[PDB]
Amino acid sequence: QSRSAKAGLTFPVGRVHRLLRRGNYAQRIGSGAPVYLTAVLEYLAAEILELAGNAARDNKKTRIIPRHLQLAIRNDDELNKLLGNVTIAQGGVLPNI
Amino acid sequence: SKARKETYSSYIYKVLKQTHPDTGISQKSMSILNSFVNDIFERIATEASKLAAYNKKSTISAREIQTAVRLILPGELAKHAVSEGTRAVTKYSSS
DNA sequence: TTTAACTTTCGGAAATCAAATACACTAATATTAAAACGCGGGGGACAGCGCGTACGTGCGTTTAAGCGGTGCTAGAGCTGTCTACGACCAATTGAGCGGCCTCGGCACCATGTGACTTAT
DNA sequence: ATAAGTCACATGGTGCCGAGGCCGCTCAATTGGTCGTAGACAGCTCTAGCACCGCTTAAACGCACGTACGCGCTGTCCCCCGCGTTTTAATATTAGTGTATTTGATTTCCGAAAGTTAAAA
Numbered sequence: 001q002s003r004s005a006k007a008g009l010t011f012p013v014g015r016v017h018r019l020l021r022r023g024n025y026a027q028r029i030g031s032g033a034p035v036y037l038t039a040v041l042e043y044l045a046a047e048i049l050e051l052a053g054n055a056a057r058d059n060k061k062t063r064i065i066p067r068h069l070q071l072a073i074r075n076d077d078e079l080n081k082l083l084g085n086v087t088i089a090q091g092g093v094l095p096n097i
Numbered sequence: 098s099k100a101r102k103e104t105y106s107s108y109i110y111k112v113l114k115q116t117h118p119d120t121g122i123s124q125k126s127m128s129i130l131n132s133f134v135n136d137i138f139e140r141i142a143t144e145a146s147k148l149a150a151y152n153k154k155s156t157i158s159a160r161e162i163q164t165a166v167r168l169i170l171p172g173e174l175a176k177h178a179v180s181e182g183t184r185a186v187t188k189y190s191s192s
Numbered sequence: 193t194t195t196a197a198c199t200t201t202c203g204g205a206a207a208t209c210a211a212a213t214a215c216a217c218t219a220a221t222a223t224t225a226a227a228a229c230g231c232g233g234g235g236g237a238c239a240g241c242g243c244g245t246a247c248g249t250g251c252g253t254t255t256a257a258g259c260g261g262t263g264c265t266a267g268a269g270c271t272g273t274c275t276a277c278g279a280c281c282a283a284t285t286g287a288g289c290g291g292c293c294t295c296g297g298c299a300c301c302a303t304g305t306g307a308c309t310t311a312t
Numbered sequence: 313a314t315a316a317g318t319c320a321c322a323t324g325g326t327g328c329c330g331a332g333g334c335c336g337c338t339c340a341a342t343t344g345g346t347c348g349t350a351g352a353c354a355g356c357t358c359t360a361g362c363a364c365c366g367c368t369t370a371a372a373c374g375c376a377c378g379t380a381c382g383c384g385c386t387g388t389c390c391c392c393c394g395c396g397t398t399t400t401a402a403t404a405t406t407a408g409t410g411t412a413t414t415t416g417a418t419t420t421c422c423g424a425a426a427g428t429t430a431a432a433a
Contacts, residue, residue, distance in 0.1 A: 001342085007189045010108050010115075011134075014341075019138065020157075025146035028350070030158030031278065032186045037141060039185030040166050040178045041134045045105075046112050047174075049130060053117045063121040064113070069129055081171040090125055098213085098415065155350055156278090 007035050011042040051076060066090040105134050141165050159186055 003013040017034040051072035052064045059068060070091025073079050109130045113120055122130075145165030146157045163182060167175045 003189075003342090006192045007185055009185060010112050011105065012108065015103075016138070020142060023139070023142055025142045026149055026155070026157035028156040028278075030156055030161075032159035032190070033145075033157055033162045035189050036159050036162045036182040036186045037138065037166075039182045040141070040162075041137055042108075042112070043178055043181045044137055044174070045109060045130060045134055046116065047177075048133065049109065049113050050116045052126070053113065053120050056120065062119055063123055064126045065123045066125045066129055069126055078171045078173045082174060089129060158351095 003035070004038075007039070009035070009038055009042055011038045011045075013038045016041070048073065048079065051079075067092055104131055106131055140169060144169055 003017075004011060007013055013035050016038040017029075020029055020034055020037075048069070049064065052068045055068040055072045055075075056062065056064055066088055067090065070088035071094070073083055073086070073088065073091075074094045106127050109127065110122060113122060141162065142157075142165075145161045148165055148168075149155075149157045149161050152161075159182075163179055166178050166182065170178050
C-alpha cells in the first residue's frame with residue numbers, strides 16, 4: 001500500500017519526501033512533515049482548480065484554460081494575496097468594472 | 098537525449114475528475130498547475146527550515162511546517178491549510 | 193578553560209574528453225495587417241476668480257506621561273536524562289512483458305493378424 | 313490340410329504445427345529492523361516584566377479665531393484623436409549551418425570525516 005493511499009491523499013507523499021531531501025532545507029526531516037506538506041499542496045491545488053472549473057462554467061465550456069485560471073486567481077481576494085506577484089501565461093488582465 | 102521530467106499533472110487531473118468529472122484541462126493550464134505546487138513547495142520549505150534554524154533545532158518537523166504555512170499563507174486560506182494538514186497527518190499516524 | 197586548525201584520508205564530486213543530435217539564425221518571399229501621415233474636434237484643462245472654509249493659528253485650563261519608588265513573579269534560559277525517531281540498509285516484496293513450452297491434432301509410414309489360398 | 317504365402321485390413325506411432333499456459337528476469341519503494349543521536353525533559357534560579365503605587369508638570373485638549381486657503385469658477389486655449397488615408401513593415405513562411413547542448417568514461421578534486429592539537433575567554 002502506498003503512502004498517499006494510507007494518508008487518503010491523491011498527491012505523491014513519497015515524491016514530496018524525496019524532494020525535501022533534494023531541497024537541502026534541513027539534514028533531519030520529521031516523517032510527518034512531508035505528509036503535512038503534501039496535504040497542504042493538495043488542498044491548494046484542489047481549491048484553485050475548483051475555482052477555475054467554476055470560472056469555466058461561467059464561460060460555458062468544459063475545459064480549463066489559462067484565462068479561467070487567471071480570472072479565478074485574480075478574483076479570489078485571498079489567493080490574490082497568496083499569488084499577488086504572479087502573472088499567468090496567456091492569463092490576461094481583469095476589467096475596470 | 099531527454100530525461101523523464103517530474104510532474105504532478107496526473108494527480109491534478111485526477112482531483113479535477115473528483116471535482117468536475119466532465120471537465121478536461123488545456124496543456125498550458127496543466128503546465129500552470131504543475132508549476133503551482135512546486136512554487137508553493139519551495140516557498141513553504143525554505144521558510145520552514147529558516148524558522149527551524151531560528152529555533153537552532155536540528156529537525157524540520159510537522160510543527161515547523163505548520164508554523165511556516167500559517168505564517169506565509171493569507172489567514173483565510175491558512176486556517177483551511179492547517180486544518181487539512183493536521184487531519185491528514187493524524188489520519189496517517191493512525192495507520 | 194572552549195573555539196578552532198592543524199592535519200590523515202578518501203570516495204564521491206567536478207573536471208575533462210567525445211559525438212549525437214538539434215536547434216538558431218541568417219535569409220528569401222509575396223502578401224497584407226497594421227503604421228503613420230494628415231486635417232478637424234470636443235473636450236477639456238487650464239486661466240482667473242469669489243468667498244466660503246478648514247486647518248492651522250493662538251490662549252486656558254486641564255490631563256496624562258513621565259518619572260520614581262515598591263514589589264514579586266512569571267517565565268529566560270537551562271536544564272541533566274531518558275528515549276524515539278528517523279536515517280540506513282535490504283529484503284521484501286512485486287508485475288509486466290518477453291520465453292519456453294506443451295497441449296492435442298493433424299498427415300504419414302509401420303507392424304500383426306484374419307482371410308484365403310495355394311501349392312503344398 | 314495345411315505351412316507357407318499374398319493380401320487387405322485394422323490399429324500403431326512417429327513426426328511436425330500452432331497456442332494457449334504457464335513462467336523468468338528485473339527494478340519500485342515498502343517495510344523490516346537497528347543503531348545512534350536529537351528530542352523532550354529535571355530540578356532551577358533569577359530577568360526584565362510588569363505591575364503597583366505615588367508623586368510632578370509637560371503635553372494636550374479644548375477655547376477662540378484667522379489668515380490662508382479650496383474649490384468650484386470660467387473664458388479659452390489647445391490637443392487628442394477618429395478616422396481617412398497611403399504607406400509600411402509585420403507578418404510567416406523554409407534552411408542548413410554552425411555552434412550548442414550533451415552524454416558518455418573517466419579522472420582527478422577536494423572537503424567531509426577522523427584524528428591531533430592549536431588556542432581561548
